[PDB]
């Protein structure tokens, strides 16, 4: 039968099948009833070339098929025919067999006694464990962005210190240039008074250059330490992401045992 077939999911949306053939291998296939919501009209989608390629299953006189010449009796016959041999018969442009089926009620990884608490209790547990680990991820991403812009604020400030220091060092190298042969001329006149005026000013220059050099390393030191904890926030987010996805899918499929009741009473209670 078609309704019980592995690869028939029913009222599933295109965006939902795109989320199920993501990064899968060529040949993975799945069929829905067409998005048109018209009875007895279906669409098959298979992975080929990194793309999800859709094809329409026409229906006429009870027969089936996806071309103007229509043949098969049921879709299960149409599909299994192309599970045994390739569909290059239809179009040589793609020549993969319907290799990997993705079924609706496999991956149902609830193993213990199916007491209704497997929903009312273990679902609320995983969902509580999912929203907590989501709270932490958003907290990390916030201080991650804060730390990100604080770092570049400091990188441009040390770059400013570099220019100021470049400009005070060239000042020293011009003081020695234009004061040398006046110091040398004062020296033989016996005018130590004027020499100490020059040296008193040269000391003043390289005295301040020491202060801005110290202010730079004190900033490079804060930068080095904040750049480090920025990398730690990164690896923590990378460790929380795979876990967060793992228990989000577990919370999602634990609605399977809610679908056991169908009507969403056992979650409306929560």
């Amino acid at each position: 039968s078609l309704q019980d077939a592995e690869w028939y999911w029913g009222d599933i949306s295109r965006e939902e099948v795109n989320e199920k053939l993501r990064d899968t291998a060529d040949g993975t296939f799945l069929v829905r009833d067409a998005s048109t919501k018209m009875h007895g009209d279906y669409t098959l989608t298979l992975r080929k070339g990194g793309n999800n390629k859709l094809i329409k299953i026409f229906h006429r006189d009870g027969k089936y098929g996806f071309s103007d010449p229509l043949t098969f009796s049921s879709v299960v016959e149409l599909i299994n025919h192309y599970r045994n041999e390739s569909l290059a018969q239809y179009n040589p442009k793609l020549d993969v067999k319907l290799l990997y089926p993705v079924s609706k009620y496999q991956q149902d990884q609830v193993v213990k006694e199916d007491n209704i608490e497997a929903v009312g209790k273990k679902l609320h547990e995983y969902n509580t464990q999912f929203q907590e680990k989501s709270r932490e991820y958003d907290r990390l991403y916030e201080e991650y962005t804060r730390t990100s812009q604080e770092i570049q604020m400091k990188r441009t400030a040390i770059e400013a210190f570099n220019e100021t220091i470049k400009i005070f060092e060239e000042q020293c190298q011009t003081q020695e240039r234009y004061s040398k042969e006046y110091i040398e001329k004062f020296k033989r006149e016996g005018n130590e008074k004027e020499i100490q005026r020059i040296m008193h000013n040269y000391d003043k220059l390289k005295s301040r250059i020491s202060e801005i050099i110290d202010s730079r390393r004190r900033l490079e030191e804060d930068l080095k330490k904040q750049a480090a904890e920025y990398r730690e926030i990164d690896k923590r987010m990378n460790s929380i992401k795979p876990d967060l996805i793992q228990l989000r899918k577990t919370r999602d499929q634990y609605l399977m045992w809610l679908t056991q009741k169908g009507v969403r009473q056992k979650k409306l209670n929560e």
């Binding site: 179009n91 442009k93 990884q109």
Partner: protein, 1005 residues
């Protein structure tokens, strides 16, 4: 760009000590005022320098200038010596004396551009990348074209640039507008100022709605010369005198009627008819308008002029292979993550040209591979817009649970560069952070380029080298290959047309797309089908692409609402995008260009290279129409912080500011005004956040009393609408608001000579902390939907109030005067039930504000606007809003507010509360059964299917925003919700019943 007048200091003290370095090695401490101009500094320095050694070496004061370091780390030469010390944005209080070198004017101008765009222009000079340097030079001709074009018929052409006509796209007003005209005529009042005391006199006229402004000036001088006993020719002479001597201006704002569009086509008067208000125009002397248009030049910059064998792709006989060498700076926990690997894919837009390939998995502690990845694609089969998308991924394993893969950092590369050459040799690009919420292992929509941030993961690759430079084949041989490979019907025609109707995101199965490719030649009969046909092309086959290039070369032009789709991320081919641009620059009006400017700026991100046909089109239009150039600037400026586009937009802004003329001076006043406001809110949010709201009120009123502040916040143009002049602040009305981010309620006087005829005081909300581009897009979309309904005849009044994002989570919002929230209005009433507000309180408040004959009008306006927002919010998923999210004017107009606040609360039915039904039914019992409600839901039905009839436009507008970085718009799957509410995969009657059932379930009837 500058948090204060000194690094880590908001304001300089009144007197500070400045270390002055002389051209002799003497250092002089100069005490000077905060506000001292550099002319005063330099003069008093060389005056003090005589007290220090080696004065003889100093030349004359006039032969030197100051240089220093800014808080942007720039060694800035202070040529403009008129600037105040505290306006220099100094890093440290010191000044280095040097002899000036280089072009003074160019340096003064670059500083003004740097302040405008938020970064120093010199940073562009240091860029090694030749694409950047070629861009800076090669668009200067677009600047020259625009400047020469607007200085052609001066001063008129110059006035048409600064004050362009604000006109609808069509003079053909619909009949529901025409029916408010007195037998096809309109009444207008013309005002004139007389000098002795600026006293004013008015002249009322009745004229045909389609009179040009000069004819209006003719009817006015004709009405005043009534009794002068003039001959038919003497009347012509003075009519000619006035027609050529005066123009018309809107009373209260800077809008003018400089071109001969029919009067009713000017938006200000198209709405005076719609709203049935009195158009007030001021007769003004043309020589007075041209007086306030100071001549402005455009000078080619220094970089504009000087600078200090191959084989075709289609001869390379080999498949593509790329080498992944090693990675760096990978941040991963070695004990929680098992292994890492590099994932890659060859993409044409968003469709992989071939299956993805991954490097082998590798320990986290040694990110090295040295693998050659082989791709299933023949090098000659590479399309020009082919891109390499890659990422570093991690894996965590388990048996009882599936293995989990996650991306760590991504990066995209153009396999061909901007010169048409195929890349070769080893390459190293720093990768980007994976955006919040994205779980796909790759990000093909992300920008192509290396991350400039340092200490970021750096991946190294190597591309094959084919003994010489390889280039994409010229178009000459491409067409010949099509002639090589290439060597009516009825029932198929109805299906082809049946496919043109389907929206851009509809499912297109394999049988349908290759059916289009088969009849690709018949498709030109229905040019609407092009986007479907392009997605049908197998872009990894040079045979098909070449054949498709010949079809787009002769494709009948489609109209802009359709061409805009071909600029989104699904059409990267440069020939397709060039065809789309040519559709815009010949069919897109400056009105609808200004309407879709948001989306047009965003698709710049999808552009593969800096120099392209789109940016030259937008830049051209921004320099010939200062209205769209104003928002062109702010939409670029608002995203400067984003390093993924900061360079692209920065180079684009440099060229605009370098050729926009005297408007740069005005923009800098706006920028400095916002800079002051954002610095005061940061102080309120970071320093005195713990202080009381009344302590903060003090900091504000006091910091707003400062002369330097008021001089900067008084007398500039409103960024929400440059036509609105913002004069003096009414500090009496200014205040912080109750929100945690504490936005500023600001209020200015309108300095217009006749401000009393429009609005005498203008007030705006400035908010720092919230991302406003969700409100921008929502309000824009609301304005589109209102325009659609009006032109169809539905007089549903929406209120897309002004909203503008000026930067990272900071922007402006237009205040709506005489309006309250429904919550505020319920509190004005009393409790009816047991601790329950009275449902009739809304209806009663509206009666008090609309006594007498005007009562019927208010109920009509409430029912029409309520129907509009009900349909709008349902379609867009805005749905369940709070009574404090919904507002209503004393007029009776209803509108929603704060849409980002709503989307942010999440990260559906529509509101039809009982209180609204009381008003709609005029306070009746079983209000769901009266004939007012009968025709109310009939308005909703017509409005719903009206938007469905233009669903392609909205889906295209949202699709163009996917690269914006808005978390609401990260994938086409996000846009799929609008396909659900509009029910695009169903028929009309099926969507109508879906909307009817939705509305019925709203009131649970």
């Amino acid at each position: 760009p500058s948090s204060g007048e000194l690094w880590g200091i908001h304001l300089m003290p009144p007197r500070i000590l400045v270390e002055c370095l002389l051209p002799n090695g003497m250092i002089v401490t100069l005490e000077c005022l905060r506000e001292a101009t550099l002319i005063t500094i330099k003069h008093e320095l060389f005056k003090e320098a005589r007290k220090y050694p080696l004065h003889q070496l100093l030349q004359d004061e006039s032969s030197y200038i100051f240089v220093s370091v800014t808080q942007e780390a720039e060694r800035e030469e202070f040529f403009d010596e008129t600037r105040r010390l505290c306006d220099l944005r100094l890093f440290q209080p010191f000044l280095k004396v040097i002899e000036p070198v280089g072009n003074r004017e160019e340096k003064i101008l670059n500083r003004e551009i740097g302040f405008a765009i938020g970064m120093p222009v010199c940073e562009f000079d240091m860029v090694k990348d030749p694409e950047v340097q070629d861009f800076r030079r090669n668009i200067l001709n677009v600047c020259k074209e625009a400047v020469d074009l607007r200085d052609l018929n001066s001063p008129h052409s110059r006035a048409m640039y600064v004050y362009p006509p604000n006109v609808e796209s069509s003079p053909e007003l619909p009949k529901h507008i025409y029916n408010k005209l007195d037998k096809g005529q309109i009444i207008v009042v013309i005002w004139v100022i007389v000098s002795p005391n600026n006293d004013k006199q008015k002249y009322t006229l009745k004229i045909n709605h389609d009179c040009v402004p000069e004819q209006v000036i003719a009817e006015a001088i004709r009405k005043k010369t009534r009794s002068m006993l003039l001959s038919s020719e003497q009347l012509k002479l003075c009519v000619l005198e006035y027609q050529g001597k005066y123009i018309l201006k809107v009373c209260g704002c800077d809008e003018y009627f400089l071109e001969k569009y029919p009067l009713s086509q000017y938006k200000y008067i198209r709405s005076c008819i719609m709203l049935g208000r009195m158009p007030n125009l001021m007769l003004m002397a043309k020589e007075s308008l041209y007086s306030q248009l100071p001549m402005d030049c455009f000078t080619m910059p220094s970089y504009s002029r000087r600078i200090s064998s191959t084989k075709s792709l289609w001869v390379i006989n080999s498949a593509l292979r790329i080498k992944i060498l090693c990675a760096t700076y990978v941040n991963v926990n070695i004990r929680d993550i098992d292994k890492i690997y590099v994932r890659t894919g060859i993409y044409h837009g968003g469709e992989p040209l071939c299956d993805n390939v991954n490097t082998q998995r590798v320990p986290c502690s040694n990110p090295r591979w040295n693998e050659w990845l082989n791709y299933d694609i023949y090098i000659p089969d590479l399309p020009r817009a082919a891109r390499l998308c890659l990422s570093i991924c991690s894996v965590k394993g388990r048996k009882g649970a599936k293995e989990e893969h996650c991306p760590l950092a991504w990066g995209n590369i153009n396999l061909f560069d901007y010169t048409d050459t195929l890349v070769s040799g080893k390459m190293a690009l720093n990768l980007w952070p994976v955006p919040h919420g994205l779980e796909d292992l790759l990000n093909p929509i992300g920008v192509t380029g290396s991350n400039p941030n340092k200490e970021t993961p750096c991946l190294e690759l190597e591309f094959d080298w084919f003994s010489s430079v390889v280039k994409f084949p010229d178009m000459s041989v491409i067409e010949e290959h099509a002639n090589w490979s290439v060597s009516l019907r009825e029932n198929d025609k109805e299906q082809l047309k049946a496919i043109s109707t389907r929206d851009p995101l509809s499912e297109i199965t394999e049988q349908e797309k290759d059916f289009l490719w088969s009849h690709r030649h018949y498709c030109v009969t229905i040019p609407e089908i092009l986007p479907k046909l392009l997605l049908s092309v197998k872009w990894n086959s040079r045979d098909e692409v070449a054949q498709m290039y010949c079809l787009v070369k002769d494709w009948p032009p489609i109209k802009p609402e359709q061409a805009m789709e071909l600029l989104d991320c699904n059409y990267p081919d440069p020939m397709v995008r060039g065809f789309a641009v040519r559709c815009l620059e010949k069919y897109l009006t400056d009105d609808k260009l200004s309407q879709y400017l948001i989306q047009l700026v965003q698709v710049l991100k999808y552009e593969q290279y800096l120099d392209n046909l789109l940016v030259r089109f937008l830049l051209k239009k921004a320099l010939t129409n200062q209205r769209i150039g104003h928002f062109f600037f702010w939409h670029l400026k608002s995203e400067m912080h984003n390093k993924t586009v900061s360079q692209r937009f920065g180079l684009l802004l440099e060229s605009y500011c370098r050729a926009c003329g005297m408007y740069l001076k005005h923009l800098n006043r706006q920028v400095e005004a916002m800079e002051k406001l954002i610095n005061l809110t940061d102080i309120l949010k970071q320093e005195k956040k713990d202080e009381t709201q009344k302590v903060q009120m003090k900091f504000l009123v006091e910091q707003m009393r400062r002369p330097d502040f008021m001089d900067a916040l008084q007398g500039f143009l409103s960024p929400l609408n440059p036509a609105h002049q913002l004069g003096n602040l009414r500090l009496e009305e200014c205040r912080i608001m109750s929100s945690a981010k504490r936005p500023l309620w600001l209020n200015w006087e309108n300095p217009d000579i006749m401000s009393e005829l429009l609005f005498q005081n203008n007030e705006i909300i400035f908010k720092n902390g919230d991302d406003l581009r969700q409100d921008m897009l929502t309000l824009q979309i609301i304005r589109i939907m209102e325009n659609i309904w009006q032109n169809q005849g539905l007089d549903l009044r929406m209120l897309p109030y002004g909203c503008l994002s000026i930067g990272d989570c900071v922007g402006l919002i237009e205040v709506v005067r005489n309006s309250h929230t429904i919550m505020q209005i319920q509190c004005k009433g009393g409790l009816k039930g047991a601790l329950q507000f009275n449902s009739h309180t809304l209806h009663q408040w509206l009666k008090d504000k609309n006594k007498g004959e005007i009562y019927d009008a208010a109920i009509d306006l409430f029912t029409r606007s309520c129907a509009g927002y009900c349909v709008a919010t349902f379609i867009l998923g805005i749905g369940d809003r709070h009574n404090s999210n919904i507002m209503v004017k004393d007029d009776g107009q209803l509108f929603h507010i704060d849409f980002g606040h709503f989307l942010d609360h999440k990260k559906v039915p529509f509101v039809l509360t009982q209180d609204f039904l009381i008003v709609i039914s005029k306070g009746a019992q079983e209000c769901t059964k009266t004939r007012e409600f009968e025709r109310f839901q009939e308005m909703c039905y017509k409005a719903y299917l009206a938007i469905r009839q233009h669903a392609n436009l909205f889906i295209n507008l949202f699709s163009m925003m996917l690269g914006s970085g808005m978390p609401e718009l990260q994938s086409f799957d996000d846009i799929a919700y609008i396909r659900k509410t509009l029910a695009l995969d169903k028929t009309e009657q099926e969507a109508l019943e879906y909307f009817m059932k939705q509305m019925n379930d709203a009131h649970h009837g």
